[PDB]
Amino acid sequence: SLGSDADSAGSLIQPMQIPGIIMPGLRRLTIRDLLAQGRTSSNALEYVREEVFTNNADVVAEKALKPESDITFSKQTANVKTIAHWVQASRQVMDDAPMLQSYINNRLMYGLALKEEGQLLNGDGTGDNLEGLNKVATAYDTSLNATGDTRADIIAHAIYQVTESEFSASGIVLNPRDWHNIALLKDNEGRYIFGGPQAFTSNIMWGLPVVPTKAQAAGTFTVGGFDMASQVWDRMDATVEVSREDRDNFVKNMLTILCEERLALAHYRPTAIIKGTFSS
Amino acid sequence: SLGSDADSAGSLIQPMQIPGIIMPGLRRLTIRDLLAQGRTSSNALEYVREEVFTNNADVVAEKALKPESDITFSKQTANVKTIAHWVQASRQVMDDAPMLQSYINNRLMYGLALKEEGQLLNGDGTGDNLEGLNKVATAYDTSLNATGDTRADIIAHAIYQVTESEFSASGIVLNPRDWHNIALLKDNEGRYIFGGPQAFTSNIMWGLPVVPTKAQAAGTFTVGGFDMASQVWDRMDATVEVSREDRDNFVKNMLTILCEERLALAHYRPTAIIKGTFSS
Amino acid sequence: SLGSDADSAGSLIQPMQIPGIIMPGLRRLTIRDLLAQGRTSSNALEYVREEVFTNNADVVAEKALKPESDITFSKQTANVKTIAHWVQASRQVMDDAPMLQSYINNRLMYGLALKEEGQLLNGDGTGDNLEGLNKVATAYDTSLNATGDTRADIIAHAIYQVTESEFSASGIVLNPRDWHNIALLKDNEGRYIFGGPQAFTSNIMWGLPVVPTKAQAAGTFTVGGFDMASQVWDRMDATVEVSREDRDNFVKNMLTILCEERLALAHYRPTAIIKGTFSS
Amino acid sequence: SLGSDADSAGSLIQPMQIPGIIMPGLRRLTIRDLLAQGRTSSNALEYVREEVFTNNADVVAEKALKPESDITFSKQTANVKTIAHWVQASRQVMDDAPMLQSYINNRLMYGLALKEEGQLLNGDGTGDNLEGLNKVATAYDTSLNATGDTRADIIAHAIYQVTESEFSASGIVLNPRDWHNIALLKDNEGRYIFGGPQAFTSNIMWGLPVVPTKAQAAGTFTVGGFDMASQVWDRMDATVEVSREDRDNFVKNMLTILCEERLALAHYRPTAIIKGTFSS
Amino acid sequence: SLGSDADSAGSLIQPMQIPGIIMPGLRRLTIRDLLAQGRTSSNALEYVREEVFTNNADVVAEKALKPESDITFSKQTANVKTIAHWVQASRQVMDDAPMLQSYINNRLMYGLALKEEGQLLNGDGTGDNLEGLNKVATAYDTSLNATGDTRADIIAHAIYQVTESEFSASGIVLNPRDWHNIALLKDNEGRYIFGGPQAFTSNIMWGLPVVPTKAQAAGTFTVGGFDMASQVWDRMDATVEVSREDRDNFVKNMLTILCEERLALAHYRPTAIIKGTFSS
Amino acid sequence: SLGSDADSAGSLIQPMQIPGIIMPGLRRLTIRDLLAQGRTSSNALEYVREEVFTNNADVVAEKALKPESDITFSKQTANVKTIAHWVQASRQVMDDAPMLQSYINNRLMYGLALKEEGQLLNGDGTGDNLEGLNKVATAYDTSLNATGDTRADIIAHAIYQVTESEFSASGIVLNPRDWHNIALLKDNEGRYIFGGPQAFTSNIMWGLPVVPTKAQAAGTFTVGGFDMASQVWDRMDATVEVSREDRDNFVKNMLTILCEERLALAHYRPTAIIKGTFSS
Amino acid sequence: SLGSDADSAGSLIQPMQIPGIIMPGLRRLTIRDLLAQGRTSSNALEYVREEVFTNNADVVAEKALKPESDITFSKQTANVKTIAHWVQASRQVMDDAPMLQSYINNRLMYGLALKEEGQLLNGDGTGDNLEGLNKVATAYDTSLNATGDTRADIIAHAIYQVTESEFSASGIVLNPRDWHNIALLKDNEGRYIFGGPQAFTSNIMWGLPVVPTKAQAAGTFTVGGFDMASQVWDRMDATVEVSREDRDNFVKNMLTILCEERLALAHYRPTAIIKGTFSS
Structure with missing residues (x-):
């Protein structure tokens, strides 16, 4: 058994060098x-x-x-x-x-x-x-909030408010931090509403895609039909x-x-x- | 690396122009x-x-x-x-x-x-x-309601009252807001009856389709066999x-x-x- | 943008008329x-x-x-x-x-x-x-019930009582309303035994088909090997x-x-x- | 749109009468x-x-x-x-x-x-x-039972006792009633060990087929390597x-x-x- | 219908006889x-x-x-x-x-x-x-155990110890009895870790297959990379x-x-x- | 029955020979x-x-x-x-x-x-x-931890801290043991967060892959965007x-x-x- | 003079044998x-x-x-x-x-x-x-009997009683002994009520047929319109x-x-x- 392992033949193989020096993390636009x-x-x-x-x-x-x-x-x-x-x-x-x-x-x-x-x-x-x-943007309707709503309930309420314009929303723009706290949202039993410990749920809430940009102020959320507004x-x-x-x-x-x-x-x-x- | 950042190759790409000067949300009929x-x-x-x-x-x-x-x-x-x-x-x-x-x-x-x-x-x-x-429409029979029923239970009772006329129900016409509250319905454990946090359940209740239009007054619900009534x-x-x-x-x-x-x-x-x- | 709505060209499109006038709910026999x-x-x-x-x-x-x-x-x-x-x-x-x-x-x-x-x-x-x-019909055997059986448990015992005859149960004839209050049967923790809130469970209990006819008196249940009896x-x-x-x-x-x-x-x-x- | 209702043509359709008079429940041998x-x-x-x-x-x-x-x-x-x-x-x-x-x-x-x-x-x-x-048959070994075993836990022990012979078990012969009561076994959470409300679990316990016959006295169970004993x-x-x-x-x-x-x-x-x- | 069960034509059919008298259970090597x-x-x-x-x-x-x-x-x-x-x-x-x-x-x-x-x-x-x-075999390392480990936790620690030799483990050799007790392992809520009443979990623990042989002394366990040791x-x-x-x-x-x-x-x-x- | 025991046909079967005289588990790089x-x-x-x-x-x-x-x-x-x-x-x-x-x-x-x-x-x-x-590496921000976070929560926080650099995390490097003790993480009910007893969850936590190397000292965890840091x-x-x-x-x-x-x-x-x- | 009596050609003739016994057997209706x-x-x-x-x-x-x-x-x-x-x-x-x-x-x-x-x-x-x-039968009408009239008179009365049904009487059913006596009935001087031994007929009374059966209980008499009723x-x-x-x-x-x-x-x-x- 002659393999590519270290203690075998790997040594004969030279890692390919990538030209130049790279730079801090580049935020995704x-x-x-x-x-x-x-x-x-x-x-x-x-x-x-x-x-x-x-x-x-x-x-x-x-x-x-x-x-x-x-x-x-x-x-x-x-x-x-x-x-x-x-x-x-x-x-x-x-x-x-x-x-x-x-x-x-x-x-x-x-x-x-x-x-x-x-x-x-x-x-x-x-x-x-x-x-x-x-x-x-038209301000969120505080009216919709109800006794005991999860942050997610609100984003939902918001997705609705867009309907009063007569167009459907196309995405949710939350702050990366807020998004996280929303995903790790638990029920009265201690179960994860979005994803059992195996893996984080996808970036999709209420049927719409989720855009987590640091650009969005902490604690502020934006929902709308961007592609048409x-x-x-x-x-x-x-x-x-x-x-x-x-x-x-x-x-x-x-x-x-x-x-x-x-x-x-x-x-x-x-x-x-x-x-x-x-x-x- | 040859990226899409501005300071790299981004320039080679032309943003697509959306004609027009800013239509409101168009409601789904x-x-x-x-x-x-x-x-x-x-x-x-x-x-x-x-x-x-x-x-x-x-x-x-x-x-x-x-x-x-x-x-x-x-x-x-x-x-x-x-x-x-x-x-x-x-x-x-x-x-x-x-x-x-x-x-x-x-x-x-x-x-x-x-x-x-x-x-x-x-x-x-x-x-x-x-x-x-x-x-x-014929009024809903208040007598079917039982001590401690979820709104869900009611719509159920409703689908039944249609049977008393001897016809099959066709769909449920709830108000978008009401629909929402029904989906996020939970059990004594904390689990979601219709769908764990991963994604909202589909628009189907008790075997029938669910039409959520703003047309339906908030707090009011209509069940029937429309396609034949x-x-x-x-x-x-x-x-x-x-x-x-x-x-x-x-x-x-x-x-x-x-x-x-x-x-x-x-x-x-x-x-x-x-x-x-x-x-x- | 030349569309199909009213504001555009929708007008040019003639809805197809379904000849004839539509009859009340027809019960399933x-x-x-x-x-x-x-x-x-x-x-x-x-x-x-x-x-x-x-x-x-x-x-x-x-x-x-x-x-x-x-x-x-x-x-x-x-x-x-x-x-x-x-x-x-x-x-x-x-x-x-x-x-x-x-x-x-x-x-x-x-x-x-x-x-x-x-x-x-x-x-x-x-x-x-x-x-x-x-x-x-042969009377149900009240001796099969046990401290704390659910309605379901009974139909179960019943499906057994049919065994004493040495024939297989064929189906369960419940009253539409009873079937309902049976499906929405919950456990000590509050979650639904048959279907959670996702969707109504199918008409199948203890392995047998369920027949819900208004004909069957409310509160009365009939299990048997009909195709044989x-x-x-x-x-x-x-x-x-x-x-x-x-x-x-x-x-x-x-x-x-x-x-x-x-x-x-x-x-x-x-x-x-x-x-x-x-x-x- | 004419169908088989009593309103359409389901009238031209006369049920087929099964020749001769009937037979009680015929049990499965x-x-x-x-x-x-x-x-x-x-x-x-x-x-x-x-x-x-x-x-x-x-x-x-x-x-x-x-x-x-x-x-x-x-x-x-x-x-x-x-x-x-x-x-x-x-x-x-x-x-x-x-x-x-x-x-x-x-x-x-x-x-x-x-x-x-x-x-x-x-x-x-x-x-x-x-x-x-x-x-x-050789008698079951009471010593295998442990504080708080389920009926299932027993049949399990039973399947083992068959190993002391040096042959694999072939099936489990239980009484229809006992089987039912096992299948509906729950956990301290209220969950169904064998099958959530959607469907009765198949007749298979601990990897073996299960035969529920009235022939088997209630409260009695038989596990063995039938196919070659x-x-x-x-x-x-x-x-x-x-x-x-x-x-x-x-x-x-x-x-x-x-x-x-x-x-x-x-x-x-x-x-x-x-x-x-x-x-x- | 003319079937081949007892009541119908079943009688016309003669079972085939296997010449000779027959064997105890055969352990699986x-x-x-x-x-x-x-x-x-x-x-x-x-x-x-x-x-x-x-x-x-x-x-x-x-x-x-x-x-x-x-x-x-x-x-x-x-x-x-x-x-x-x-x-x-x-x-x-x-x-x-x-x-x-x-x-x-x-x-x-x-x-x-x-x-x-x-x-x-x-x-x-x-x-x-x-x-x-x-x-x-090299003796298990008692220092890996930690306050409150399940038997499973141990076998895990075991699989690891194999790694301190820089080799991957092959399988787990437990005594049929011990394997059993491990599968029926429960959590503080009463749910089965591998089990869940419906059916026994497969013979696979921590990614490795499990070999349950009576040959292995009750109470003793063996983990290793057999195929290479x-x-x-x-x-x-x-x-x-x-x-x-x-x-x-x-x-x-x-x-x-x-x-x-x-x-x-x-x-x-x-x-x-x-x-x-x-x-x- | 024609089996492969000794006294039957096992004789017709030739054991496969492992060339050579006795390699230990080969660690994965x-x-x-x-x-x-x-x-x-x-x-x-x-x-x-x-x-x-x-x-x-x-x-x-x-x-x-x-x-x-x-x-x-x-x-x-x-x-x-x-x-x-x-x-x-x-x-x-x-x-x-x-x-x-x-x-x-x-x-x-x-x-x-x-x-x-x-x-x-x-x-x-x-x-x-x-x-x-x-x-x-830059030290983990102790301020992100909150009353009652699971180890999982921490790696989560960590995956975030990488964002403050403006780059996406690439993977999680935990110690094989720690990885294990994380997977077997339970909720307040005793349920497995990542995977019910049926099978071990995949090596993916919070959307990122998990690299378990003994190289990583027990108790220490590393997260970053390696691929370009x-x-x-x-x-x-x-x-x-x-x-x-x-x-x-x-x-x-x-x-x-x-x-x-x-x-x-x-x-x-x-x-x-x-x-x-x-x-x- | 070739005749059919014994001394002549009477011998040439063989009597026909009545096939089947009705051998005894009275000649009576x-x-x-x-x-x-x-x-x-x-x-x-x-x-x-x-x-x-x-x-x-x-x-x-x-x-x-x-x-x-x-x-x-x-x-x-x-x-x-x-x-x-x-x-x-x-x-x-x-x-x-x-x-x-x-x-x-x-x-x-x-x-x-x-x-x-x-x-x-x-x-x-x-x-x-x-x-x-x-x-x-409807019981005989005692109210028809006359001051001192023979057993004969009664049967005659009965023949009349039939009329009130709208049917003509068909026959008489007496007991043998009774019939034998009724026949020899005499008046106060000795003349037979019926007909002297001169031209005695048979089982015929009042122009009707008579069935003398030991079946007919002694002392009882049955008259009706048998041929049609x-x-x-x-x-x-x-x-x-x-x-x-x-x-x-x-x-x-x-x-x-x-x-x-x-x-x-x-x-x-x-x-x-x-x-x-x-x-x-």
Whole structure:
């Protein structure tokens, strides 16, 4: 028996080396992928919506006057904004460690997109910040909560609230921590509602997929029909430029690495998104 | 590694653009699909039912006069009512925002059908309105409720009360919220009667399908043999027409978009439908 | 987006009309199907049972006198009865509504077969009534019950009592409502013995099929080896004839629709049928 | 949509009547099929067993007289017996009811076969009777029972006792009642050890088939390696004959119907069968 | 229906008779099939083991002395022993009972193989006895037990101890009685860990198969990597010979039947086998 | 019956021979295959990482001073060490037992790789030892534990702590014993969290695979995204050489078998690995 | 003169032998001969009796309303019984005397016919007995007797009493002794009431036939309209059969000669039959 074991022949086999050094854990991006995408070449977008189906169809006697029914504009603007950050590094460093620039690029790129998510989800609405899902969204109906509901019951309640818009939800966006505490949810007997110790249940709650992003604030939840409520409009892709003469660089032996991007977040159907807060 | 991060290869990929400037949640229609569907070309339907088999068969003494039995009857008329509504729009608005028209169409269409459901289920009966399932239905028998029954037990009792009329139940029409509370029903141990935390149980209770529409008033439940109890008779399919000369219009630079439909709801066997209320 | 809803092109689509108008809940017939069936051309049946094959076969010595045997014991009589009813209808009504006849038939045919079930199960022996399963039945053995048996436990004991006859139980004839309150039977911990809340357990208890007929009195249960214990003898198949001359019909423009049949229920092995009462 | 209801065409369908009048519950014969079967044509069988391989092989000192061994032994005789019974019936009854003839056959037949089971299992062993599994069997070992064993725990111990013989058990012969009460065994949680409410567990305990026969006295159990511990020897298959002239008969307008069979039950290894009592 | 049970035509059918009288339960041989087998034509076997690959490879400073390694050690001898027994029967018996010949063979064969298994497992090591698994085996490590371990927990600890020899375990050899007590192991709630009343769990514990042989002393357990720790060396396959002239045989009309076999049991890696005692 | 006992047909069956004279359980290697591999040809590796992206981007008022950000950096070194051992065997042994050499090689190889794993995981990081996963790793956050968490809960928390780095966990490295004691984890009812007695649960906890290596000291647990947090750099594949003239061999008829290897363990992202202790 | 008396050719003629004994046997009518006779292939008879025919036919003036009439029954059952007896005779005797069997046949039949008459008249109507003429009869009307009138006068009165049934009297059934006396009845002077010895007829009184049977209890008399009011139904004509193997016959050289007959008797009008007692 001549095997690939250590104490056999394994020694004759050389592990394949993977070029270069790798970097901390890279957060997996999401929010963006939940939305509809498309690009533009303008500084802003304009779409138009109707500003109620009154269905009185009913039973009518003979010779009688039948019922009258009815059906029910405003222009909405969505602006493009700019996201970016830059790094200043010495001319020395940069020349002495070649691959350093290559790295700083990949890093600013990511870092940018990271903060990009930030806006798309928790977009303040103040000054320039984008109007993000969580702001636009119609507030959760505290009314639905009932004496003795699990956090899961709420997400459920929320999935419903979306129905009052007349569209179905497409996903649940909880904070990774909250998601965990929900999965390890137990019954009065001490059994796991989602999964006996063997393995964590999948990322599916109430028929919908679950997106656990750190982007989502701890203790805050978002449910909606993303793929049909908002759309991200890219004006300018993420890019990186470098300047030797920026400000007082030439005279300080300094470089400036810049990374920017231009977006626009549109919100067609707000009624299709809901922001809530576990109250415990 | 060649990744999708911005600082890597992400750039090579174009986000997909979602047309439009931000439609609300579109409610899923039902009820109508539970009923038998026919089609007519009259302004009313007439059918005949026995008001009645009076079976007096019994035992008879010798030399005695035997019992007289009888079979019937009454004629029932089902009128064809008309449901519709219209919208008026500026000649200008319509010209300046092209897609606005096709949008208004799809909305009146839906709106119509939405109020249509409204009749079919909770059809008032007043003058011109239709008479709907919930009105025609026979009341739930409070006597079947037993000390300590789960809401589930009730719907069960209900499915039975349909049997007392001698017909098979077809489905259960609960309110989305009520349905939820029923699913998360537990046993004295803490276990889920319908489905452990892994996934919500399917929409099937006591062997019958479960239709959860917001149409069904919160706290109210309807069980019956729909596919055989009532029937919907279509006279004229829902349609959309547009007039630029309608009265004022021409001289006011206005358009009128109209949407109408012609139905008739017939209720053959009311004993086959049941409406009740959970006592909370 | 050119869709199928109202707002779009739905209007162009014509719902298919189901010709005809829809009848109340039709009960599912049984019992009769649990019994052996046969023909006859008499007004009563006479059968013989051992209390007779007198089988004296045995062991015989050499030159010895062999044993004598015989074949026939009790003689039992089962009379043939007559079930029927008629409906008198107008000649005009019958010609003005083509399918009214076809309907009246399936309606009498049914009603007849319905009271037929009635006899077969809860017979009587009184004059013209048939002697049915529940009358012939052997009393349930109260000695089998034990401190703390559930209803189920009883039907179980019952399925056993049928063994003493040395025949296999065939099915369990409970009352629809009892079956229900049996399935929802829980344990000391509160979870459902038959089906949890997922879905109703099938109609199968202790390995045998369960027959729930409203015919079976509430609170009464019948277990037995039906396919072996009794047999239904048909003298005249349920039929329907019509007379335009009956009485003063010819001269009043009336029709008489008659529906009758001639049965006879024989009970060979009563030890094979058990009747009992749930003491709540 | 016309079907087999009483409302549609299920009227044109007349049930098929099963020829002739009925038969009580016919029990399932079993004990026999557990045993080894074979035919003969003799007064009795003789077989030889060791009382005896006397193996004295052992350790031997140097230059000493080695051990003497032997192979045999005793001759065991197993006699053939005769089982039968007859029934006499009047020439009239027989001529008046044509099928009474064939019925008395099927009954004497079954009846014979029934008492056959009787011997095979609980055979007295006295006088002319047969020695049955239960008589020959080695008694259960009370010492195996432990504080708080279930009835199941016992049959388990029983299956082991069969190992002390050095052969594998073949099946478990319990009383229908005892079986039932075992199958419904629960845990301190209220769960069903053999099968949750959905279906009765199959007739298999501790890896062996289970035969529930009324033949087995209530409260008594039999576990053994039937398939090769005992063997049934058939000399004459069950037969039915009829005499018109037996003694009186001709002159008394009588018939004699006889049914006999010839067996022989051999018990090769008794240490292979166990008979015990659930003491509670 | 014309069936082949008792009451119907069953009688026309004659069971087939198996000629001759029959055997006690036959234990199922096992321990042999666990070890590696091989042929030989010697008086004994010799093998060499390290007490050794002394590998000192290491890290070495510059211009420093490399480390010296070596390969080997001890010589181990395994002797070939002889197992057998004979039986003598009369010439007459043997000629008068045909099948006695073959029967006696199969018995001596099995018998031999039985005591063979005996050596393999509990081989004394004394004088002529073989040296078996349980003797060589390294003692269980009492330090692995922990307050409140089930018997199962121990066998687990056991399987691990095998790993401290850097080898995988092959199976678990328990006593049929102990195996039983382990399967019926319960939790603090009263539920069965492997069991659950429906049926006994399979013969698999902690990922390894379980061999339940009576050969294993009650209360003693053996876990190891058999297929790689010891080997059985067959010098002479079990054989049966017969002699008519053996000593004063010819002159006594006697026969002598002999059965012998030649084995050798080698134990390569003892650290791969473990023997323990449940202490309670 | 024709069985395979001794005295039947067992004789026709030839036992399979295990070639050779008596290998112990061969341990399964792992730790290595979890890391990224690549080869080098130097005595050390140098890589550079950010010590820190201090991102201060924020919202800025009109005509107000903007925020200054920075990016770091540190040069990290990783030396390559040497692992090896040797064995010394007699010229005679080696010549008299041909296959001995082959065996010794496969053994040194294995033994080497065994200790190799030892470094990769628990690498002291001290003198000449490698810096192992466990030394580099960031300590488990004791603050995540909550009143009444099971060991399982902890690894769960741990799997989370990896997220704070922004990378996904790759697997869980527990000690074989600890893994066991986790699987047999019970709830407050005594039920098995991972798997009822039927069968052991798969080696998957919280969605991640589980690696049970004896290398991991009992009581210690490691979780991280190995596949890209560290990388193994091979300088010299494990090899085996032989010298006849080493030291004073030639003059002692001795041989020296040497087995060495050259490694280097690089640790890019420590924040992606976590070490902790169960405090029971 | 060739004549047919002894002395001439009378010898040429052989008397015809009456085949069968009814040998003794009086020449008289039988209670049978008086009744109506029929045949049936059944176990019993189901006839109907009239219990009212209101005939208002009359003369009618023209232009005048004519008279209305009306017609109005009871169901009766009459079982078939069996009369028989047998004789055991020597096979030798039966072969040696040929004429002997011929006699025994006729004689056994004659004897049967006597007891037949017995049942037909004094038939108990009880268990196996027939329902005879006397059991049904309406009692004689004492109110018809006149001051001092002969036994004759009474029978005459009875003949009248019949009339009130609407049937004519058919015959008289007296006891032999009684009839003998009634015949020799004289007046106060000596003239015979009947007819002098001149032209004496036979069994004919009051123009009716007379059956003188020892069956008719002394002092009792039966008069009715036999030829129509009641009739005998034969199921099996008197028959003789012989058995050579009857029970222990074959082995004793014996023959068994059986003679049976089976009939039934129905009475359509009791009021047409009258029984009374001579008060003297």
